[PDB]
Amino acid sequence: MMPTPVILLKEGTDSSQGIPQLVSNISACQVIAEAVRTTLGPRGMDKLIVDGRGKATISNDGATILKLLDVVHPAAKTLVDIAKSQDAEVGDGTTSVTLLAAEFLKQVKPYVEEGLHPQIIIRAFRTATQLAVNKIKEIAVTVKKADKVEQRKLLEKCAMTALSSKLISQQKAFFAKMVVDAVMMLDDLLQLKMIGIKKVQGGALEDSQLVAGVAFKKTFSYAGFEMQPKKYHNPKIALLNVELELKAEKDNAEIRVHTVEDYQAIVDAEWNILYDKLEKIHHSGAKVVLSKLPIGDVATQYFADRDMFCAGRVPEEDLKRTMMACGGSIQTSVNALSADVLGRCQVFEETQIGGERYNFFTGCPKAKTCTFILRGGAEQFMEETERSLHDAIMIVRRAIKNDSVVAGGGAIEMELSKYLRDYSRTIPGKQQLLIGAYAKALEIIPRQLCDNAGFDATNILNKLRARHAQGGTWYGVDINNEDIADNFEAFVWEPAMVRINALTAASEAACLIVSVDETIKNPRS
Amino acid sequence: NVDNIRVCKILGSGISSSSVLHGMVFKKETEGDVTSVKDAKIAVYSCPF
Amino acid sequence: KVADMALHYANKYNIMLVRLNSKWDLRRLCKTVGATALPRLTPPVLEEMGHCDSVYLSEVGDTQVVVFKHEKEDGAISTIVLRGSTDNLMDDIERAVD
Amino acid sequence: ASMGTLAFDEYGRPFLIIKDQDRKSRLMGLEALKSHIMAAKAVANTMRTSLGPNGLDKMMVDKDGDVTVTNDGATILSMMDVDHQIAKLMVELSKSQDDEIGDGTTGVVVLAGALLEEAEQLLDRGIHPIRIADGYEQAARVAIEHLDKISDSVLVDIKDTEPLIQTAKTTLGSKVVNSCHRQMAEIAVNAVLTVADMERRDVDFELIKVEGKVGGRLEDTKLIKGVIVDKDFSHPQMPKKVEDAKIAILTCPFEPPKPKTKHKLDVTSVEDYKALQKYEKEKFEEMIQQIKETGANLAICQWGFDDEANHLLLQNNLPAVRWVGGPEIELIAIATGGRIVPRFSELTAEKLGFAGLVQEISFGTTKDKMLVIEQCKNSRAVTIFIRGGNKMIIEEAKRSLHDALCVIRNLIRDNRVVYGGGAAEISCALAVSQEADKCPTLEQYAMRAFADALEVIPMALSENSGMNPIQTMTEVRARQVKEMNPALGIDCLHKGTNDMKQQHVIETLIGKKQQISLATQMVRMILKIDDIRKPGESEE
Numbered sequence A: 001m002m003p004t005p006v007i008l009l010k011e012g013t014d015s016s017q018g019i020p021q022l023v024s025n026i027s028a029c030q031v032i033a034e035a036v037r038t039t040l041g042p043r044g045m046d047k048l049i050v051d052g053r054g055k056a057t058i059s060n061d062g063a064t065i066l067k068l069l070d071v072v073h074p075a076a077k078t079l080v081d082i083a084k085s086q087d088a089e090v091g092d093g094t095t096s097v098t099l100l101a102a103e104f105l106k107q108v109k110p111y112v113e114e115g116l117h118p119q120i121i122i123r124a125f126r127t128a129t130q131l132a133v134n135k136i137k138e139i140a141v142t143v144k145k146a147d148k149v150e151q152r153k154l155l156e157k158c159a160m161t162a163l164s165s166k167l168i169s170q171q172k173a174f175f176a177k178m179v180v181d182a183v184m185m186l187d188d189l190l191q192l193k194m195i196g197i198k199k200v201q202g203g204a205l206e207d208s209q210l211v212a213g214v215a216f217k218k219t220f221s222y223a224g225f226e227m228q229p230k231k232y233h234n235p236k237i238a239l240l241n242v243e244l245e246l247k248a249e250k251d252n253a254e255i256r257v258h259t260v261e262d263y264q265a266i267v268d269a270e271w272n273i274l275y276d277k278l279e280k281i282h283h284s285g286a287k288v289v290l291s292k293l294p295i296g297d298v299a300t301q302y303f304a305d306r307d308m309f310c311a312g313r314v315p316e317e318d319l320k321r322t323m324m325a326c327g328g329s330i331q332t333s334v335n336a337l338s339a340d341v342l343g344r345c346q347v348f349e350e351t352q353i354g355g356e357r358y359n360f361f362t363g364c365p366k367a368k369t370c371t372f373i374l375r376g377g378a379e380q381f382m383e384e385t386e387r388s389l390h391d392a393i394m395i396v397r398r399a400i401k402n403d404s405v406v407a408g409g410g411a412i413e414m415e416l417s418k419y420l421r422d423y424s425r426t427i428p429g430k431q432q433l434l435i436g437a438y439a440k441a442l443e444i445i446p447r448q449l450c451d452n453a454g455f456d457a458t459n460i461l462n463k464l465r466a467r468h469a470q471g472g473t474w475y476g477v478d479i480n481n482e483d484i485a486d487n488f489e490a491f492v493w494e495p496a497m498v499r500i501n502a503l504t505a506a507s508e509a510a511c512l513i514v515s516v517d518e519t520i521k522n523p524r525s
Numbered sequence B: 001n002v003d004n005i006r007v008c009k010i011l012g013s014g015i016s017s018s019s020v021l022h023g024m025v026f027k028k029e030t031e032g033d034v035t036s037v038k039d040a041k042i043a044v045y046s047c048p049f
Numbered sequence C: 001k002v003a004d005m006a007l008h009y010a011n012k013y014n015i016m017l018v019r020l021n022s023k024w025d026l027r028r029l030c031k032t033v034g035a036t037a038l039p040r041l042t043p044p045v046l047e048e049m050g051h052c053d054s055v056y057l058s059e060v061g062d063t064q065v066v067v068f069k070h071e072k073e074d075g076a077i078s079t080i081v082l083r084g085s086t087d088n089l090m091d092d093i094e095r096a097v098d
Numbered sequence D: 001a002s003m004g005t006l007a008f009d010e011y012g013r014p015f016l017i018i019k020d021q022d023r024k025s026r027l028m029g030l031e032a033l034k035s036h037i038m039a040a041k042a043v044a045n046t047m048r049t050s051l052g053p054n055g056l057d058k059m060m061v062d063k064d065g066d067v068t069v070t071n072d073g074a075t076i077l078s079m080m081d082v083d084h085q086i087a088k089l090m091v092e093l094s095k096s097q098d099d100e101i102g103d104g105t106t107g108v109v110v111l112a113g114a115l116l117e118e119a120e121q122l123l124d125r126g127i128h129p130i131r132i133a134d135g136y137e138q139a140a141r142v143a144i145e146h147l148d149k150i151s152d153s154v155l156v157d158i159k160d161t162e163p164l165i166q167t168a169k170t171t172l173g174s175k176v177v178n179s180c181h182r183q184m185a186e187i188a189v190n191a192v193l194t195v196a197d198m199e200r201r202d203v204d205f206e207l208i209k210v211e212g213k214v215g216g217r218l219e220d221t222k223l224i225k226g227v228i229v230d231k232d233f234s235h236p237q238m239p240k241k242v243e244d245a246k247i248a249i250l251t252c253p254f255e256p257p258k259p260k261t262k263h264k265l266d267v268t269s270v271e272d273y274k275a276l277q278k279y280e281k282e283k284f285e286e287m288i289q290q291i292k293e294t295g296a297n298l299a300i301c302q303w304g305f306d307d308e309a310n311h312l313l314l315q316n317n318l319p320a321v322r323w324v325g326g327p328e329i330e331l332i333a334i335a336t337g338g339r340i341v342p343r344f345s346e347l348t349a350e351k352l353g354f355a356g357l358v359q360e361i362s363f364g365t366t367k368d369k370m371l372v373i374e375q376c377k378n379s380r381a382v383t384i385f386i387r388g389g390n391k392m393i394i395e396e397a398k399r400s401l402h403d404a405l406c407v408i409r410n411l412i413r414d415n416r417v418v419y420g421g422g423a424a425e426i427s428c429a430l431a432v433s434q435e436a437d438k439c440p441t442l443e444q445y446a447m448r449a450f451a452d453a454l455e456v457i458p459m460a461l462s463e464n465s466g467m468n469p470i471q472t473m474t475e476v477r478a479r480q481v482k483e484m485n486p487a488l489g490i491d492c493l494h495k496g497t498n499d500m501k502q503q504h505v506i507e508t509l510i511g512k513k514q515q516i517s518l519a520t521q522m523v524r525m526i527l528k529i530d531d532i533r534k535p536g537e538s539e540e
């Protein structure tokens, strides 16, 4: 490198090329995998990350941990990206994707070091991934009976398997029943915004409840609110988007009068406008009034005088959930408050929950929504409970869409590894080594489960390999019994699409990382 | 016209899941309560509603 | 923008509302549907009314999308929906498509 | 073992994975668990000296130099300035116990610290922390079932409030207001029973106005079955005492009307000016006459009023109060049984509240005046008015009375009780130990560690009372085993008996269950953290 009088690229440009930079990329991916390695399976542990502002986040979700880690390595960001993609498409497996991708790269690292062409490795990965996905689709167990009880039991088993790695795993049956009940309420789109999740500090985990309706926090009551009754036994609910306050008619409206009589008439006209809106609301028969826009003290006292309930500043999501639970319509005008635009609920009540007041709409038979109320001893406790419930909800939704399951605990990975090894033993031999490396890398999941559980991974892996070789598709790691067991009979069930997406994303990330031969870093602006 | 070919990128399912749609896809939601129409009769306004 | 009263009356009359910020997107939708972007809020005449086989709200992955779908293998604009596991991978696939 | 990773590649090229990775810190494995357990133990051992009647107070100073002397565990932990995340978790645990129950915010921290201390020696023997958490959960379930078994039911009737008085006295025993023990307990019980939906529903604390003023004596604290107001009569020459008052609660200022919309009234001639001034005078006279027509003896306004209205009210024998806050307006309306009227046109005789006596109260040589609205017919709002020799004991009395109110609220929600002084903890430890005997070997260690950690409360109570912890606790446990009596606990006050039922040391069952549950969940959550990633920048 003789210094030219005029340099080509901008001064400070860092360029890395050849085998060493690809080896470094593989090492960076290994580091990223190790960052979430110990968060796998029922014996996995949690991670605590503190930001610059000092707030701590405690989580077991791989995607959350990777997002919180401020990864700047260009090759290492691929693992975070595929974890986010797995979270988006499936919602579970965000740790398995990173472990599998890094293990693929680690397995092909020795061949990379000896100058093997990356295109051969990419082709081998693509072939192995296609074969594995086809095998998963072929051997996945499906129940073609359309039995409600069996389908619900499948949902509950999948939810329990998804939840049996988090801090709420002790109450996993309870929370899985709650989640299955919650998802089956949604009609056809299974929108996440139709499942409210409220976290109230204080209380045990078992105190968490799923209200078959809508519940939301009290919203800045005005004077005279305490005079309103706090329980109704068959109320009609007036869902409104209306500001019930004494205010200017319009921001650009100016009143010009030249008589005191007209002044008094204008004052009385403003009062009469407000009272006409209130009378239109009251004569509709509604006893509970909810609004997005503020409800003033005058309206609060007016409704208290009529033994009605009012709540202003209700958030958009809460009002939409109330509409979907009760069966009304959010009205921006009170001129036509017909009987078909008013919600109906069996019981409305305001109760005390852990130092906060909540409004409950229960007994809604036609409800297409529900609200989770989570009780815990800490903010991060409730946040991680919400994350675990989100994982379970996504799993249950995917199970609704496609009810194909495979046994977890590394059983599917071991079966795929055996199949891929058997296939690779019947090809010329340049691709045989790489497909065998892929099959061996597929063993990272049961080995990591055993390592986290404190087992001896070598003996368990040997027993699993021997069992799969001689027959038995669904034999995996038994955490409690320190041994192996038929995970299908043990109800360790996960949807097949979870593993399909995991393998696809891991293979794509590995191929993308391998395909790069040069990294160029322009100087920071 | 090259412009008449639009590309919408959505994460999650690998490039083998890509498809061609005869129409347009916009990454947004609907303002109102109706979310599905079977015999659309779209009226387009440049002015605010 | 969409007014609150306008949205309320659109809901009352069962009208699906879609708001497009980009003028380029509006022009492309007009081209692919067959409608004229009216400058006022007058009802559209027969020739100015657009037509499409199906308009619906759908979720792809974790993204909420609005799809204007034609059943016929025709039209002025066609859209390629690219899936993938990484943003960079989809950018590369988009470059290949270009 | 820290600073993330430092390899810089095997080819000598830069190896940067995480932004500012050379400044960030990392702790992983059993070392992180040991550090967390040691921090939690430090917090719990700091807090354990404020447990029981003989417990002592922490005296906290904020960043501005203001001094707070308190015995409330949640308040102490909130006032603390900590960086350790486990300490913040303990503070949040105390906050959770305060929010859900309102009492026992110190027992939760001590229990969690003992649980983590036992988990430390369990970890040193090679047990997976998840196994320890599972054993703790199993033992907590056993203890909660035992608590349900050994509970007792008390009457929550207004006719006989003696069990409620005893429970409130037990709650207040550890506080500084124990010099007025029965008085504070009885006023708390009466306050809760006054403002309460009788059908086992909630108790809204917004109907209890707790306000304190310096001066007087702590024994002068009283329960007012009405509303206290920081204001006074607007005109200095109106009478300071109104009897059989008919109160007109108003939210409209005694001023000429003002449209909300921006407006302009045009005066174009002298006749217009005369009409305008006549209109203003007539509006003042008309509002005064409208108030007087309803027969009201007293007027209360929220938005103040000007000189003409003031002198007209004085001239018409209408004592008036102005600039009353919105919450105070609502409380007055609730207590006096009157409605809130937004304008004089809607004022009628049927909307007037009634109070048997409205008085203005002086406070020595301070020129400060306050209003008492009491002797209401069936007032559904109550006020606790606290006196003391300094503001610090006033704040402590405020939070102690809040604890008592929360305890009576808990009794209203659920009337099952257990007996304190460590009797419940000792019985639960015995039940857990008995259950562990008939259980597989591996989780026996976790269950026995849970029992030993449960035994910390009687030991702390005995130590704070100057007795030998191990000897007294062992003797009480042996006596509990010998004769079947789970009411035997630590005799902290040296009354000569260990039967805590005779001593009338009563605490809510739900409080103990919530204590055990919260401690177990927090301990499990802490035990599951095996890696810490701090910025480590030590910013200013």
Ligand SMILES: Nc1ncnc2c1ncn2[C@@H]1O[C@H](COP(=O)(O)OP(=O)(O)O)[C@@H](O)[C@H]1O
Residues within 6 Å of the ligand: A039, A040, A041, A042, A044, A062, A092, A093, A094, A095, A096, A161, A162, A163, A164, A165, A407, A408, A409, A410, A445, A449, A477, A478, A479, A492
């Ligand atoms: N009860 C169980 N016994 C054995 N293995 C389990 C059990 N529950 C879950 N697993 C395994 O743990 C693995 C990881 O699950 P989890 O950590 O919850 O989410 P992620 O897949 O994102 O890591 C799954 O592959 C599954 O096979």
Ligand SMILES: Nc1ncnc2c1ncn2[C@@H]1O[C@H](COP(=O)(O)OP(=O)(O)O)[C@@H](O)[C@H]1O
Residues within 6 Å of the ligand: D050, D051, D052, D053, D055, D073, D103, D104, D105, D106, D107, D170, D171, D172, D173, D174, D175, D419, D420, D421, D422, D457, D461, D490, D491, D492, D493, D505, D507
């Ligand atoms: N008179 C008493 N004699 C013995 N022990 C008591 C007495 N009163 C309360 N205790 C015990 O002191 C413990 C701590 O109560 P206290 O300090 O008042 O509130 P906290 O539970 O918030 O610390 C309770 O567990 C209770 O059993």
Ligand SMILES: [Mg+2]
Residues within 6 Å of the ligand: A092, A093, A161, A162, A163, A165, A391
């Ligand atoms: Mg999972």
Ligand SMILES: [Mg+2]
Residues within 6 Å of the ligand: D103, D104, D105, D171, D174, D403
């Ligand atoms: Mg106490």
